[PDB]
Amino acid sequence: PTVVGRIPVLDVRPVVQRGRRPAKAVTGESFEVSATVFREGHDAVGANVVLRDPRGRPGPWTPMRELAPGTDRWGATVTAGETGTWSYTVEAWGDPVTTWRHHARIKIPAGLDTDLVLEEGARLYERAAADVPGREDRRELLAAVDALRDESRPAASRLAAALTPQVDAVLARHPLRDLVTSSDPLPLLVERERALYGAWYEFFPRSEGTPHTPHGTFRTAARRLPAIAAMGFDVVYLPPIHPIGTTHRKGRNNTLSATGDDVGSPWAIGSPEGGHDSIHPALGTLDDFDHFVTEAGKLGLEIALDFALQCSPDHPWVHKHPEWFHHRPDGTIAHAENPPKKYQDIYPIAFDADPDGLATETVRILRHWMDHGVRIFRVDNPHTKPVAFWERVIADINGTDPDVIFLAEAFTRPAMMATLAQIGFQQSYTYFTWRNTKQELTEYLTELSGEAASYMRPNFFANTPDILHAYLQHGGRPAFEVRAVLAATLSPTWGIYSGYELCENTPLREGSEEYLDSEKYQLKPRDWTRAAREGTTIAPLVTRLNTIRRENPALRQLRDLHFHPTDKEEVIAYSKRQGSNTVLVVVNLDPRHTQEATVSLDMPQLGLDWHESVPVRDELTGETYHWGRANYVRLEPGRTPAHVCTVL
Amino acid sequence: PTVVGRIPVLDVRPVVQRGRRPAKAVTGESFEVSATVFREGHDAVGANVVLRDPRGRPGPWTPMRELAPGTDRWGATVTAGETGTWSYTVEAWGDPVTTWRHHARIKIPAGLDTDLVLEEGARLYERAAADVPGREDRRELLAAVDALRDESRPAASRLAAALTPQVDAVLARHPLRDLVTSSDPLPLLVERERALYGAWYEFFPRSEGTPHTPHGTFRTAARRLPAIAAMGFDVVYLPPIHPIGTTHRKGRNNTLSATGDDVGSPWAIGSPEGGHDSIHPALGTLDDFDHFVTEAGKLGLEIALDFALQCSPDHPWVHKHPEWFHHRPDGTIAHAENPPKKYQDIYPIAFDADPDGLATETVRILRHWMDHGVRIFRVDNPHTKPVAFWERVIADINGTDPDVIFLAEAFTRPAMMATLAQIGFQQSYTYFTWRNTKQELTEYLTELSGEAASYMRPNFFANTPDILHAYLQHGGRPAFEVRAVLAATLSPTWGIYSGYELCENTPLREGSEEYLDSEKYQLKPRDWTRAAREGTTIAPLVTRLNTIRRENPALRQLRDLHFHPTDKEEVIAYSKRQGSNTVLVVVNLDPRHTQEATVSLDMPQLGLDWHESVPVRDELTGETYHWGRANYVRLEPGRTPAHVCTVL
Ligand SMILES: O=P(O)(O)CN1[C@H](CO)[C@@H](O)[C@H](O[C@H]2O[C@H](CO)[C@@H](O)[C@H](O)[C@H]2O)[C@H]1CO
Ligand SMILES: O=P(O)(O)CN1[C@H](CO)[C@@H](O)[C@H](O[C@H]2O[C@H](CO)[C@@H](O)[C@H](O)[C@H]2O)[C@H]1CO
């Protein structure tokens, strides 16, 4: 058997790790399948993509086209249906009809071998008709044959009969394919919509307490949920909800020694009160948690729990499973680190003594939370645990529960980030917060929406409790508005950490990306009602952005994205399209000065002619404009950061 | 089982078609194996390449290095040994000793639990010691352990004892490797030297006849061979040596109708006198051919026969095997074409009728000529025959006779050229003749010496009987000299077609790359003794260049090639290196005007420091210069077309 088939079809894409891992999609998501296709000699080829579902059923007729002259690179758009494991192949074939048409269009007006040429055509159309299932279509082709086979008609008329629109249409749906040759199947993993699309909100339940009881419970915190749903979020991410260690507990502002009533870091998981399968007592009971999850569900909110595979010195595992830790010669355990960050309040897990036990317990914990309605897990620092560990665990869980979504919080080097996405993580944190210039945003989103989209789904958190970027520190509220517009419109999944709405932007110190008085080490009660009343929140803008996303399919996908040139470095423009839905966004990245620029739109990417002029509506303001190949903007920081426009 | 191992090792290169075909090398050839390597956490990693020969024997320990900071791409040079099918794997591992040294070098002068750190090191070196086979190396490590375990000595001294060069050297040879994780093996095909390296000469035996017998025989043509060997060529390529058809035979200058004693195209193979396994009667007998091959061998010349899978209308197959041709409805067979070229004197083969018969007869023919000492075949237009046909034939032949070399004459699109190389062709023709500017040469050779070298070996014919480039037409002898230097020094394999050294450069008509009075359609007697006597030939230069190649290993490999900047578009500079041998070449691409320029050498690429000044000798003249980071050169057409310099 040969590696190359009768008609060469090579380098089918997307492909992940030479086919040992699946490419990714979600229900209803479109993407391009491509291949290198050609044959020997000078005759024509055709090609088509055959997509098969988990039950083995082939998809619709899906012909490919050469993507650029002389490249032999062919492609077509496909769309994923029901969730599950699909497969796809590319079929390549000789296209004798196209070749015959090519020669005939030349030879008939030249009187060259006309009887012979027309007869060759008749014999081809006969073969074509042989494989057409519908009887009227078949008869249409046989009628073409018969007209071709008629020496009483002029050569030009005989040829013309072979060139009618109805014939073109039949051959379009059921072409005569010579020597059909197939690629080897590639795996495609189709997961649910929320894996790609959703708006996330992070907050600390313990901060949402009462005057009488400052430490919030699930019962008290659930009162915040309606406000979160009203802002249009779909997923709530909670920091670890388990008991917190006392030994080496951190004090306020990440100080080494807790004093008095310091509450410590949620990531310092575990005490005699229980471990990762337990709830912090100040939060309430398992029944209270169930209540919280239910109220969230009623409001259209899914819960994402933090999973941080590490533990405090007081965690039961420390004495129950000593071999789950690396011990120095005196038996002591060094606290965990991810330099230059130090985590004096926790021990790291060692994975090479009892990998089976660690995996088994991990999936036991996960399956526990899944039993209590948690179908999403935000995984802390997975890059400091073995890659194959996550591969195994995720495979186990999704093996039984494919709806479960895992989000990789890996701010690290590109190789590790990519590998983690490839082995099963449904979503990944990204370099987004560190991409603020037009060049940074454009290059990075070009990357994310490009080849990487075949294995990675980005979750754009505009901030996190560990990351307050300088852009926001120096820029204030207009910057929050800009970053919100950007995050919300560039990724089908985005998120913020509570306080972002209030434009909280005071750093621990100059040069730091930490918050002053960080919520990680102390309760941080917020007067939401007052902020709302005094209008010092961008919650309305957040709500509008999520509504716009909910009303415009173009913003609920990733791969279709195009940047348009402007004449100002501070002003960026880009468009996203999904079916007949087109959204155009123009953002002023300068949070301090009014910026005017001319935007020169790439009209064919919008599906328009260069001379054409089209009506747009700015969904942030309701204003309408008429935009063409050259458009003036128009952006004043504070009054408006950006246009988020739909094409009318 | 997981796709990723304990220590990730990913995207191992070189790789051909995702592992379904082998990467290529020849005996003695070095190339880089690379991989993406990293681990969880922050500890150091190490990596090494394992080459296993056809009997499964591993090569030496071959450690990798990170090729660039922060990229996680690691690489090492390996060298191929005996011919056959090899395999290679990359091993990745934790490097705990490197990690420990890093931490210890900081912590010990600082006084941070130094007893503990030194004990960790001692226990580590004990582990490292356990694996070392050598007794003395073992004693050296255990001595380091004991010095580490000596609280009577200063901490800095205990640590210093662990850092001596002797110890570095031991761990450098037998490092302590944690959690060794291997890639899946990739195949490497090692073929004989001549597959990569050799000088080729094409000529028509029929032109070397006598006053009394104008049509040459193998016995008369054999008298031309000494001069060819004297020019330093290793391989002689003969156009088809079979009987030539009479039906529709072409006349002189590619005219439609032969008249009189017109000799026709050698590529119009076959008559009732015999087919592809027979010899043209005017050339003599099989015995005469055996004599020719023997005399060539005596002179150190190998024969490459043209294999052109096509037929004159008089070929026996036409009536013996009608199904090997595509017939039109009137039973006639359309003549072959390669648009816009027309081959009115031949029929093309049809392959999907009796594929086995065609393959069987092809390999039968090849084995016939192999039995008469032909171990190289130059294959005509393989891209107009099915790719899998060649894959099959070459696999079949090399399965029994791995020394046989196939050269693909496929001037076509890049995808086909690459695929043909990848499926088994030992050598490929290239776009060389159409790369004449500095930009063209640099970019194309960058391509060929880069990733493509994993599957393709270039044969630089500076001309062929079908290609007389405009550069040569307008430039005359100095241009022939330039292209000779370029071809001979840029590829380890190059060639010319007879008459090149005479600077034959008259085209068929303006705008053509065909020769006037082409040898393809007529006897072309040349008075070689006279040409030599009158000095109107660059045969001595050819001889000199081949001598330089034979004397300088740098020119007998492909992959090591670097271009150095000059301040003139018309002046190109590049270096090639193999071990301690370095060749530096500077070429004036202007064949009409003296050019002077400054050549600024990239000294690290030469293995020299930026301040160094090095003696070089131009092997074309014997002249010596002293060159450094910036050098004046003056190159004069007709006198000094180029410098071909050796270092020291
Ligand atoms: O490196 P990163 O992943 O960005 C930080 N990780 C989490 C991100 O999800 C942070 O919440 C957390 O860092 C906090 O918690 C640590 C231990 O609980 C503290 O030592 C540190 O003082 C604080 O910052 C730590 C968890 O693993
Ligand atoms: O397309 P290319 O491969 O470069 C042309 N093929 C050979 C090269 O290997 C050429 O020598 C050869 O073209 C010659 O032979 C033809 C038929 O024998 C003639 O029609 C043409 O008049 C002549 O030129 C033809 C063979 O296959």
Q: What is the DSSP string of B50-107?
A: EEE-TT--B-S-EE-EESSTTS-EEEEEEE--SSEEEEEEEEEEE-HHHHHHHHHHHH
Under DSSP, is residue B112 helix (H, G, I), strand (E, B) or coil?
A: coil
- Are A415 and B36 within 8 A, CB to CB? yes
Measure Cα distances from A534 to A484, A528, B410 in Å: 21, 10, 76
> Is the peptide bond between A14 and the residue preceding it cis, with omega within 30 degrees of 0?
yes
State which amino acid sits at residue A590. Answer: D
Tokens 């020094």 found at: B489
Query: At B419, which helix (H) or strand (E)?
Result: helix B414-422
Please name which ligand lies nearest the alpha carbon of A343: 1
In whole angstroms, give the CA distance from residue A62 to residue A81.
Answer: 15
In whole angstroms, give the CA distance from residue B346 to residue B340.
Answer: 15
Nearest to B391 among A2, A21, A392 (CB): A2
Please name which ligand lies nearest the alpha carbon of A248: 1
Q: How was this structure determined?
A: X-ray
In whole angstroms, give the CA distance from residue B328 to residue B148.
Answer: 89
Q: Which residues contact A399 (CB under 8 A, 6 or more apart)?
A: none
CA of A437 to the centre of ligand 1 (A): 28
> What Rg do the C-alpha atoms of chain A give, in angstroms?
30
Report the residue of chain A nearest B15, measured CA to CA: A18
Looking at ligand 1, which residue's alpha carbon is closest to its atom 3? A381
Residue A545 exposure: Cα atoms within 13 Å on the Cβ side? 30
Q: CB of B520 within 8 A of CB of B508? A: no
- Chain B residue numbers with beta carbons less than 8 Å from the beta carbon of A8 are 387, 419
Q: Which two tokens stand for residue A199?
A: 């708006």
Q: CB of A203 within 8 A of CB of A303? A: no
Q: CB of A498 within 8 A of CB of A462? A: no
Report the residue of chain A nearest B20, measured CA to CA: A3
Under DSSP, is residue A17 helix (H, G, I), strand (E, B) or coil?
A: helix
Instruction: Give just the sign of the alpha carbon dihedral B112, B118, B121, B127.
Output: negative
Q: How far B326 CA lies from chain A's nearest CA (Å)?
A: 12
Nearest to B413 among A72, A383, A388 (CB): A72
- Are A119 and B329 within 8 A, CB to CB? yes
- Chain A residue numbers with beta carbons less than 8 Å from the beta carbon of B4 are 387-388, 391, 419, 423
Q: CB of A203 within 8 A of CB of A504? A: no
In whole angstroms, give the CA distance from residue B148 to residue B138.
Answer: 15
Beta partners for residue A94, in sequence order? A45, A178
- Chain B residue numbers with beta carbons less than 8 Å from the beta carbon of A416 are 38, 72
In whole angstroms, give the CA distance from residue A420 to residue A417.
Answer: 5
In whole angstroms, give the CA distance from residue A196 to residue B74.
Answer: 33
The residue to mutate among A200, A263, A265, having the most atoms of ligand 1 within 8 angstroms of its beta carbon, is A265
Nearest to A116 among B40, B330, B423 (CB): B330
In whole angstroms, give the CA distance from residue B82 to residue B54.
Answer: 9
Q: Which residues contact A388 (CB under 8 A, 6 or more apart)?
A: A423, B2, B4, B5, B6
In whole angstroms, give the CA distance from residue A571 to residue B414.
Answer: 41
End-to-end CA distance of chain B: 56
Please name which ligand lies nearest the alpha carbon of A242: 1
Name the class of domain B95-173. Answer: mainly alpha
Torsion of CA B177, B183, B185, B188, to 10 degrees: -90
- Chain A residue numbers with beta carbons less than 8 Å from the beta carbon of B19 are 18
Q: CB of A352 within 8 A of CB of B179? A: yes
Query: At A156, which helix (H) or strand (E)?
Result: helix A155-160
Q: CB of A453 within 8 A of CB of A547? A: no
* Ligand 1 pocket list (CB less than 6 A): A 250, 254, 265, 267-268, 308, 338, 341, 343, 345-346, 380-381, 409, 411, 465-466, 520
Beta partners for residue A35, in sequence order? A74
Domain A1-94+174-192 is of which CATH architecture?
Sandwich (2.60)
Q: Which two tokens stand for residue A66?
A: 């050469």
Helix axes of B165-173 and B135-148: crossing angle, nearest 10 degrees: 130
Phi, psi (degrees; rounded to nearest 5) at B217: -115, 170
Q: Is A409 one of the catalytic residues?
A: yes
DSSP labels for A417-470? Answer: HHHHHHTT-SEE--SGGG--SHHHHHHHHHHHHTGGGGT--B-EES-BTTB--H
- Are B423 and A5 within 8 A, CB to CB? no
Tokens 């791969």 found at: A559
End-to-end CA distance of chain A: 56
Question: What are the strands, taking DSSP E only, across B528-612?
Answer: 562-564, 571-578, 581-588, 595-599
In whole angstroms, give the CA distance from residue A105 to residue A107.
Answer: 6
Beta partners for residue A363, in sequence order? none
Residue B328 exposure: Cα atoms within 13 Å on the Cβ side? 17
Please tell me chain A's helix, strand, coil percentages from 3-state DSSP, rounded to the nearest 5.
Answer: 35, 25, 40
In whole angstroms, give the CA distance from residue A107 to residue A101.
Answer: 10
Angle ∠(A561,A566,A572) on CA atoms, nearest 5: 50
Instruction: Give just the sign of the alpha carbon dihedral B290, B295, B298, B300.
Output: negative
Looking at ligand 2, which residue's alpha carbon is closest to its atom 3? B381
Q: Which two tokens stand for residue B218?
A: 């193998």
CATH topology of domain B193-559: TIM Barrel (3.20.20)
- Are B10 and A119 within 8 A, CB to CB? no
Q: Which two tokens stand for residue B9?
A: 């090792």
Q: Which residues of A are annotated as a binding site for alpha-maltose 1-phosphate?
A: 250, 310, 345, 381, 520-521
In whole angstroms, give the CA distance from residue A560 to residue A536.
Answer: 35
Looking at ligand 2, which residue's alpha carbon is closest to its atom 9? B380
> Is the peptide bond between A565 and the residue preceding it cis, with omega within 30 degrees of 0?
no
DSSP labels for B467-516? Answer: B--HHHHHHHHHHHHHHHHHHHHHSSEEEEETTGGGT---BSSTT--SBT
In whole angstroms, give the CA distance from residue B463 to residue B515.
Answer: 11
CA of B420 to the centre of ligand 2 (A): 19
Q: Confirm whether residue B588 is marked as ligand binding.
A: no
Please name which ligand lies nearest the alpha carbon of A306: 1
Q: Which two tokens stand for residue A299?
A: 């409001």
Looking at ligand 2, which residue's alpha carbon is closest to its atom 22? B254
DSSP labels for A594-625? Answer: -EEEEE---GGGGT--TT--EEEEETTT--EE
Report the residue of chain B nearest A352, measured CA to CA: B179
Q: Which residues contact A349 (CB under 8 A, 6 or more apart)?
A: A309, A310, A311, A324, A325, A358, A385
Does residue B188's CB lie within 6 angstroms of at least one atom of ligand 2? no
Q: Which residues contact A38 (CB under 8 A, 6 or more apart)?
A: A8, A45, A72, B413, B415, B416
In ligand 2, the atom with minimum distance to the C-alpha of B344 is 20
Looking at ligand 2, which residue's alpha carbon is closest to its atom 20? B343
- Are B413 and A179 within 8 A, CB to CB? no
Closest CA to B430 of B417, B449, B441, B439: B417
In ligand 1, the atom with minimum distance to the C-alpha of A381 is 3
In ligand 1, the atom with minimum distance to the C-alpha of A265 is 18
Resolution in A: 3.2
In whole angstroms, give the CA distance from residue A285 to residue A289.
Answer: 6
Does residue B295's CB lie within 6 angstroms of at least one atom of ligand 2? no
- Chain A residue numbers with beta carbons less than 8 Å from the beta carbon of B8 are 387, 419
Q: Which two tokens stand for residue A76?
A: 């077509």
Question: What are the strands, taking DSSP E only, across B119-252?
Answer: 178-182, 186-191, 198-202, 235-238
- Are B330 and A383 within 8 A, CB to CB? no
- Chain B residue numbers with beta carbons less than 8 Å from the beta carbon of A388 are 2, 4-6
- Chain A residue numbers with beta carbons less than 8 Å from the beta carbon of B123 are 329
Q: How far A76 CA lies from chain B's nearest CA (Å)?
A: 19
Q: How far B416 CA lies from chain A's nearest CA (Å)?
A: 8
Q: Domain map of chain B by residue range?
A: 1-94+174-192, 95-173, 193-559, 560-648
Q: CB of B43 within 8 A of CB of B96? A: yes
Report the residue of chain A nearest B42, measured CA to CA: A338
- Are B179 and A352 within 8 A, CB to CB? yes
From the candidates B140, B314, B361, B380, give the one annotated as an active-site residue.
B380
Q: How far B386 CA lies from chain A's nearest CA (Å)?
A: 5
